[PDB]
Amino acid sequence: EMLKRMYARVYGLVQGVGFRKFVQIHAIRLGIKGYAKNLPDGSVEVVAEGYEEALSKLLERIKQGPPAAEVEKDDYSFSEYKGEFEDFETY
């Protein structure tokens, strides 16, 4: 398998810092589809599909965030590609 589905969630100073826009820019550069979403607890989740290597690159960016973010904690999982998405959105 060359494709995967990734789920990731980050905590810390991760909302109001341009995080979703940052993830989207990187996802589009990497050819990844899915979305980034602000959650009510202050965390951000990302659901993404595409080449496993590209998803790993996107995860490295997710772990860092844009310069105004500070990611304190994360979790993530890679599972079977479902072919669910057509672009990369934010919510």
Swiss-Prot record:
The active site is at R20, N38. Residues 5-91 form the Acylphosphatase-like domain. Optimum temperature is 81 degrees Celsius. Thermostable up to 100.8 degrees Celsius. Poorly active at 25 degrees Celsius. Enzymatic activity is increased 4-fold by temperature increase from 25 to 45 degrees Celsius and more than 9-fold at 98 degrees Celsius. Its EC number is 3.6.1.7. It comes from the Archaea. It comes from Saccharolobus solfataricus (strain ATCC 35092 / DSM 1617 / JCM 11322 / P2) (Sulfolobus solfataricus). This is Acylphosphatase. One of its GO terms (molecular function) is acylphosphatase activity. Gene3D superfamilies: 3.30.70.100. It is an enzyme of class 3 (hydrolase). Keywords: Hydrolase. It holds the Pfam family Acylphosphatase. Belongs to the acylphosphatase family. The keyword Hydrolase applies. It catalyses: an acyl phosphate + H2O = a carboxylate + phosphate + H(+). Optimum pH is 4.7-5.7.
